[PDB]
């Protein structure tokens, strides 16, 4: 599944719902800390629609548990990420992923 650990608190009140668009900054890392992707490096927040299945399951279910303004560490099992096949060569088979996610706003 996905484990959500707070880095810094959000408002504690505004949680995203299915169909809403979330705006986030994120960094994705493998278990040894290697970064594989980051919106901060592009200086461009990332948007996705909750429930559209346009991101991996853990990032979706994890952000659903975040409030606006929160920054959190999401640890995601491979079955909630890229599974047995992965995303070669950047994501190996059966990889647990760690994302640092900041929920900036809902649209």
Residue numbers in the entry: 1 to 107
Authors' text:
The peptide prolyl isomerase FKBP12 (FK506-binding protein 12) was initially characterized for its role in binding the immunosuppressants FK506 and rapamycin. The ternary complex of FKBP12 and FK506 with calcineurin inhibits the enzymatic activity of this protein phosphatase, blocking a key T-cell-activation pathway involved in tissue transplant rejection. The binding of FKBP12 and rapamycin to mTOR (mammalian target of rapamycin) inhibits its role in regulating cell growth and cancer progression. Evidence for conformational flexibility within the 80′s loop gains particular relevance due to the fact that this loop provides a major proportion of the interprotein interactions for each of the four distinct protein–protein complexes that have been structurally determined for FKBP12.
